């Protein structure tokens, strides 16, 4: 910031192979990585989950790789996502949700495992339960119609060498189309 600018820490749309994000507990209905398309019609890695019929009360977790924070005291996280209208999903029931919750946890090295940091608030720091202003609709026989949602969250103040972001779903039906972490330098 001898020249002032925003500096990227992570941009999923630039991943050319697979993201390798870690999921838990890896049961039926788990988060799945899928190839999607961005605004330039280029292939990008995305994550989807839609466990609304079988077990809408089962939590499904998704964790990023470890992100070294460099000088950053606050980091911004821009999330772009589709959220299905519960009423469009056949045999979704009363338990279906139209939100997901975003957490982070700071660590001094990339020490996470399949089971740790423990998959729960504390250690994870709850940032926001994110609502969707735009619901995607699908009517029998027809193409889905909808808009993409965007939410930017501010994380910090940060003090350890790096951090993980984690997403908790429980009975929602959504596609995480992109994550971009950046800070002001």
């Amino acid at each position: 910031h001898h020249h002032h600018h925003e500096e990227t820490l992570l941009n999923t749309k630039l991943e050319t192979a697979d993201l390798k994000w870690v999921t838990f507990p890896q049961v039926d209905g788990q988060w799945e990585e899928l190839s999607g398309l961005d605004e330039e019609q280029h292939s990008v890695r995305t994550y989807e989950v839609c466990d609304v019929q079988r077990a809408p009360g089962q939590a499904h977790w998704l964790r990023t790789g470890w992100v070294p924070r460099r000088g950053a005291v606050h980091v911004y996280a821009t999330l772009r996502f589709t959220m299905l209208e519960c009423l469009s999903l056949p045999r979704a029931g009363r338990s279906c949700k139209e939100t997901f919750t975003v957490f982070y946890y700071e660590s001094d090295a990339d020490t996470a495992t399949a089971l740790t940091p423990a998959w729960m608030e504390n250690p994870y720091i709850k940032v926001d339960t994110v609502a969707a202003e735009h619901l995607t609709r699908k009517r029998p026989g027809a193409e889905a119609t909808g808009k993409v949602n965007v939410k930017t969250l501010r994380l910090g103040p940060l003090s350890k060498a790096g951090f993980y972001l984690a997403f908790q779903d429980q009975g929602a039906c959504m596609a995480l189309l992109s994550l971009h972490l950046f800070y002001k330098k």
């Binding site: 209905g29 799945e32 899928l34 190839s35 999607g36 398309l37 961005d38 995305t46 989807e48 989950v49 839609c50 466990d51 609304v52 019929q53 589709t82 299905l84 999903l89 056949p90 979704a92 995607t136 699908k138 029998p140 889905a144 909808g146 808009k147 993409v148 039906c173 959504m174 596609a175 189309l177």
Partner: peptide, 14 residues
């Protein structure tokens, strides 16, 4: 406007 995959858990809802 890409919203979700033809091959994922969302598509499987129908």
């Amino acid at each position: 406007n890409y919203l979700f995959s033809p091959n994922g858990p969302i598509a499987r809802a129908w």
